[PDB]
Design a protein around this ligand. Structure first.
Ligand SMILES: *C/C=C1\C(=C\c2[nH]c(/C=C3[NH+]=C(/C=C4\NC(=O)C(C=C)=C4C)C(C)=C\3CCC(=O)O)c(CCC(=O)O)c2C)NC(=O)[C@H]1C
Ligand SMILES: *C/C=C1\C(=C\c2[nH]c(/C=C3[NH+]=C(/C=C4\NC(=O)C(C=C)=C4C)C(C)=C\3CCC(=O)O)c(CCC(=O)O)c2C)NC(=O)[C@H]1C
Lengths: 315, 313
């Protein structure tokens, strides 16, 4: 039965169990993962509204100084580029990405999308022809199995993960791991089927719009936004589009029970429907640089294209 | 069928017989790079371009004897493994060579039958492709996608005119988008016949997705020997970027007023949906790392055209 969301935990909304998984409002945790920083600021005036508590550690600035300034004074060169690439009324999937030279944190990756009248700003630290060779490999795959096989090994060879899996959905939302490149000693997941209440209904929806989510350390503690609610509206901040969005404690409990430390999955969208995920497991905590994650963001599109062209020939 | 080429006593290509030219076998390359062909198993350089001495910085006839084991020691193992016998000619492998004379060279390699083809170009030593990608995806229709695709590629490439050339069902075409430098004629809106791209070109351009012409006034640099030592036949160059352009098509681009032309094939459902056309008024060699982004934007747009045209239909 599809039911609507609870309030979050910070708006008096109940604690989650296995009975009511589909009612968690995962899109509004009011908190980011600690490996980066996140501001939200005004769409038009550039007024810095909220920030993650740890934004000082990362930006080498105090909140009182930060929040008492505009994005014009803070990001003088970037601000017009933000305005130009993210005009008003544009979709929240659209991101503008840039590099900074921040004196305290070194080179900083700035990712920015708009959510109504709210520019969400992310900050991460950031540090030869392997994707091109990967591109032509996938295309010259003879069939959907050799496509799936090369994608998973390519993805592993680029990223360095313990278990990379291409996971495919079925018509009734049941899934099954169709290919994997794994670490030597790890027990296979190849050909396991998994029930429909594993990736729940509110999750699969969000995963069709935004095509890359991750979890760095399944033992880390969510860094909360400050203030937790959006001053514009006095309502939760839509952090569904943010990659720094903290992962749910239901999900973190699960991954710890498997001996997993880090997780990454690229979505594969065919016909505007979630065809499958390129999931990645790691036994230790593992942060992937944003510039390297851009390579995987590309592979998701590339694979989504070939997935279709392969299935056209299977008929 | 095709005629014999000019170098094997074939007829000259008038506008009458404009669909029987063997475009894939010109027996020559463009002067801004260097082509070597090599045997699959042994690795002996069977044929080279006459300008090879320039870019490879070696003597002319000394390279004919040597093997790719001796020449490219580190990459030679990778070429065999990455281009296995039986693979399609569309599968390319690429790497960067650090040569002693020419400096950073760009090696691109693909296999055809028993023979490998090795293309050497000069090459250089960031978030615009990511921003473009999302700019294509948030585009709310086909026309709004078409403007963003052309305007993207121009700002990346610095070309004087970037067009998007959509194909009607009977090989007729139309320009549905066109970013361009100020003070040029507008080809936005105009349609053109199906004689323009012949039957062989259209078929070849579905399999192979990027060609160019860096200089429309330069001369082709022939292969030596012209024919393939194995087969004593024409060397299939129809998957090489350094391949020379049909002399009709250069003679055309001069009458237009173009020094350098490039294109990217947008393929939807096995068929050729359209091309991304780039014109420059002057000669312009686009370097391999920048060209890679354009091939990338081809697949992206090929994907996005399918999503958008579903919303129309
Ligand atoms: C209470 C309901 C359930 C639940 C909650 C939940 N899951 C996700 C996202 C998931 N779940 C995945 C499940 C798998 N684990 C595996 O080992 C395999 C197969 C190899 C599968 C299919 C996956 C892959 C995801 C996506 C993210 C990831 O790759 O780890 C969420 C959303 C998390 C969020 O913060 O948005 C939630 C709330 N998980 C259950 O397993 C089930 C008991
Ligand atoms: C002899 C018969 C004809 C002919 C031959 C021919 N054309 C190509 C490649 C073409 N033709 C194109 C048509 C256009 N040229 C333009 O300037 C525009 C305007 C936007 C169009 C539509 C195009 C786009 C190509 C691809 C490359 C490019 O110019 O961007 C070939 C292939 C040559 C080869 O070596 O592969 C041949 C043989 N063209 C005629 O117009 C007609 C006289």
């Amino acid at each position: 039965d599809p039911l609507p969301f609870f309030p979050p935990l910070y708006l008096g909304g109940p604690e989650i169990t296995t009975e009511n998984c589909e009612r968690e409002p995962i899109h509004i945790p009011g908190s980011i993962q600690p490996h980066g920083a996140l501001l939200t600021a005004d769409g038009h005036s550039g007024e810095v509204l909220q920030m993650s508590l740890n934004a000082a550690t990362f930006l080498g600035q105090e909140p009182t100084v930060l929040r008492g300034q505009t994005l014009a004074a803070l990001l003088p060169e970037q601000w017009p580029a933000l305005q130009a690439a993210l005009p008003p009324g544009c979709p929240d999937a659209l991101q503008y990405r840039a590099t900074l030279d921040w004196p305290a944190a070194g080179h900083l990756s700035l990712t920015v999308h708009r959510v109504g009248e709210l520019l969400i700003l992310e900050f991460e630290p950031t540090e030869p022809h392997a994707l091109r060779n990967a591109m032509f490999a996938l295309e010259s795959a003879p069939n959907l199995r050799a496509l799936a096989e090369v994608a998973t090994q390519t993805v592993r060879e680029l990223t360095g993960f313990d278990r990379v899996m291409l996971y495919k959905f079925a018509p009734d939302a049941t899934g099954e791991v169709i290919a994997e490149a794994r670490r030597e000693g790890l027990h296979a997941f190849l050909g396991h089927r998994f029930p429909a209440s594993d990736i729940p209904a509110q999750a699969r929806a969000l995963y069709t719009r935004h095509l890359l989510r991750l979890t760095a350390d399944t033992r880390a503690a969510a860094v909360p936004l400050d203030p937790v609610l959006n001053p514009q509206t006095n309502a939760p901040t839509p952090l569904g589009g943010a990659v720094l969005r903290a992962t749910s404690p239901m999900h973190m409990q699960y991954l710890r029970n498997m001996g997993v430390g880090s997780s990454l999955s690229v979505s594969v969208v065919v016909g505007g429907q979630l065809w499958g995920l390129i999931a990645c497991h790691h036994q230790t905590p593992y942060v992937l640089p944003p510039d390297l994650r851009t390579t995987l963001e590309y592979l998701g599109r590339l694979l989504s294209l070939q997935v279709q062209v392969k299935e056209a020939l299977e008929h």
